[PDB]
Design a protein around this ligand. Structure first.
Ligand SMILES: N[C@@H](CCC(=O)Nc1ccc(OC[C@@H](O)c2ccccc2)cc1)C(=O)O
Ligand SMILES: [Yb+3]
Ligand SMILES: [Yb+3]
Ligand SMILES: [Yb+3]
Ligand SMILES: [Zn+2]
Length: 610
């Protein structure tokens, strides 16, 4: 038995394992480069090892040093999105289990697909620049040479130099600050990560950062003007950490800090160990998007502790994480709320399947990513098909109490390791050996490997959903003589989550007649709502229903923030509406140079330009 990562060009885990990284680097805002040395401790897994291969993407290599001597190296030609393979020739041949430190002096490209450089005018303070990393899935190679695969896990110590008036933070514990020994006006921040992580969890941020304390092991980081709203928005963090510890075992990372990025941050969150990255679009002003925090918190076990071996098995990361997320929200707000969110996720699943097509290879639970850019295939499917499976099994195996017992053991058995769907399923059968017959009733083939909607829908409690269906249906079937009965009172007992679910449900039946959508704004005033989730679905409904007045609103939102879940479909909807098409394409061309590289490439492909 042997399994290879088809997203990596580096030497595989069965040949050699990276065990440690010493990073010393300089952050240069003038050149937009990351400069420095990456010292890799490498353990050989076979006898007679003469050379290894590492991943790179648009990297400049200065020199390769092994034991104080320069050695031979060769970069192969670029294989599109995978980058360029780097063969390093070792001077002394390695036996099984032997270690060598390989020091690579590197410079990053200004166009690194891992990083976004912000000018002062692109930030909030407007006086200092900004940089952030997003390595997931395979962008770490665009920062440093590494085995860019989640099948390898490594500790790391880092030392990064930044201008005196800026703060560096990494996916590690802060080791304190001391001025550069060979310095301009600079500060050299030190970091240590004692826990072995996959390299996609390596992260760096540099900007005019200030912090506020909101929990015993939690600090919110952001620019001065965001720190206030953030401290309030995420107050529930420690209480979420506590419930997550009860569900998955002890939290091993020591510290759980949050960082609120610039609006161009491409995701809801990123579970960078010790330092969760979140979008500023979470700042609703009422804590209502805090499920995203629960999500990143849950990754401290499912994802960061037990890690997908290859990206083919991404669903292990996200399925279990969404499962724990919804349990945190459930234990906080009630079991009925947990069902409401679970049904809404099925809803999102339905949408991804309709969008891709019910026979699309990207709707499979386990996808073959041979010659597929992980960024193109990314969707809600692994999240929600993954949640549905676990949810279904939970109901099948006798409830959440029993299944959370499996979950805890699963985290315990596979902690600090990298696993496949098969390891998971094999452990499932091992744990529930008293229930093998029940497990053989499940259509494993269809769930794991079939496209489309799952072969079976779980059971959902409907308490909080009914009012959403009632109202959505009323609008969807509305005629002229219903329009005057619609009223602000329709919304009186609805939470922001229910409002969102109402719009999601109505969006599935778009377009609605223009007159009806105009009447919707007349009676509900959905334009005045700043909740990003609500605004997003609302503006999509408007654009898809041919409302011209919504064009500048959707244009504003699509470019005033970068979160791909909002930005991409807004651009797509605006391209599909003939009134806005030209303007959508023009707006993207003006904004693309100052957008995030991954977001730019994706929106560009969405729009069929370049
Ligand atoms: N982890 C964060 C979001 C950023 C992220 O997951 N990045 C990312 C990007 C591309 C990926 O690609 C693999 C993906 O294309 C895929 C799709 C379907 C099935 C398996 C894998 C995986 C993760 C979070 O959950 O809050
Ligand atoms: Yb150089
Ligand atoms: Yb340079
Ligand atoms: Yb009627
Ligand atoms: Zn996740």
């Amino acid at each position: 038995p042997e399994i290879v990562d088809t997203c990596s060009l580096a030497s595989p885990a069965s040949v050699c394992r990276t065990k440690h990284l010493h990073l010393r680097c300089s952050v240069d805002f003038t050149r937009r480069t990351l400069t420095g040395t990456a010292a890799l401790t490498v353990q050989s897994q076979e006898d007679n090892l003469r050379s290894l291969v590492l991943d790179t993407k648009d990297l400049t290599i200065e020199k390769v040093v092994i034991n104080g001597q320069e050695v031979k190296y060769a970069l192969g030609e670029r294989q599109s999105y995978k980058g360029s393979p780097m063969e390093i020739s070792l001077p002394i041949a390695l036996s099984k289990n032997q270690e060598i430190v390989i020091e690579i002096s590197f410079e990053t490209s200004p166009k690194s697909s891992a990083l976004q450089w912000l000018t002062p005018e692109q930030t909030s303070g407007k006086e200092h620049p900004y940089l952030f990393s997003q390595c997931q899935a395979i962008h770490c190679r665009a920062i440093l040479p590494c085995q860019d695969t989640p099948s390898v896990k490594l500790t790391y110590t880092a030392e990064v130099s930044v201008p005196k008036e800026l703060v560096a933070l990494m996916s590690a514990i802060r080791d304190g600050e001391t001025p550069d020994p060979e310095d301009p006006s600079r500060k050299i921040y030190k970091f240590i990560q004692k826990v072995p992580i996959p390299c996609y969890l390596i992260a760096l941020v540099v900007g005019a950062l200030e912090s506020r304390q909101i929990g015993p092991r939690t600090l919110v980081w952001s620019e001065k003007e965001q720190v206030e709203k953030s401290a309030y928005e995420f107050s529930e963090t420690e209480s979420m950490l506590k419930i997550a510890e009860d569900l998955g075992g002890p939290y091993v990372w020591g510290q759980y800090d949050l960082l609120v990025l610039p609006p161009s941050f491409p995701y809801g969150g990123m579970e960078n160990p010790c330092l969760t990255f979140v979008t500023p679009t979470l700042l609703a002003g009422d804590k209502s998007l805090s499920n995203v925090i629960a999500h990143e918190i849950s990754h401290s076990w499912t994802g960061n502790l037990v890690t997908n071996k290859t990206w083919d098995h991404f669903w292990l990361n996200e399925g279990h994480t969404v499962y724990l997320e919804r349990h945190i929200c459930g234990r906080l707000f009630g079991e009925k709320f947990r069902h409401f969110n679970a049904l809404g996720g099925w809803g999102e699943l339905q949408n991804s399947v309709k969008t891709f097509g019910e026979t699309h290879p990207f709707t499979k639970l386990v996808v073959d990513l041979t010659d597929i850019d992980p960024d193109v295939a990314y969707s809600s499917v692994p999240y929600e098909k993954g949640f549905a499976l676990l949810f279904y099994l939970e109901q099948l195996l006798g409830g959440p109490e029993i299944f959370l017992g499996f979950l805890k053991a699963y985290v315990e058995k596979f902690s600090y390791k990298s696993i496949t769907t098969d390891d998971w399923k094999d452990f499932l059968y091992s744990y529930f050996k008293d229930k093998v017959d029940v497990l053989n009733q499940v259509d494993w083939n269809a769930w794991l490997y079939s496209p489309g909607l799952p072969p079976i829908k779980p059971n959902y409690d409907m308490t909080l959903t009914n009012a959403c269906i009632a109202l959505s249906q009323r609008w969807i079937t509305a005629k002229e003589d219903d329009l005057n009965s619609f009223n602000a009172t329709d919304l009186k007992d609805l939470s922001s989550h229910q409002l969102n679910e109402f719009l999601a449900q109505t969006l599935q039946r778009a377009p609605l007649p223009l007159g009806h959508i105009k009447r919707m704004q007349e009676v509900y005033n959905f334009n005045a709502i700043n909740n990003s989730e609500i605004r997003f679905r609302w503006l999509r409904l408007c654009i898809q229903s041919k409302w011209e007045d919504a064009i500048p609103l959707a244009l504003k939102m699509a470019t005033e923030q970068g979160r791909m879940k909002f930005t991409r479909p807004l651009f797509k909807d605006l391209a599909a509406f003939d009134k806005s098409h030209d303007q959508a394409v023009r707006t993207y061309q003006e904004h693309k140079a100052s957008m995030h590289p991954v977001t730019a490439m994706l929106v560009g492909k969405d729009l069929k330009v370049d």
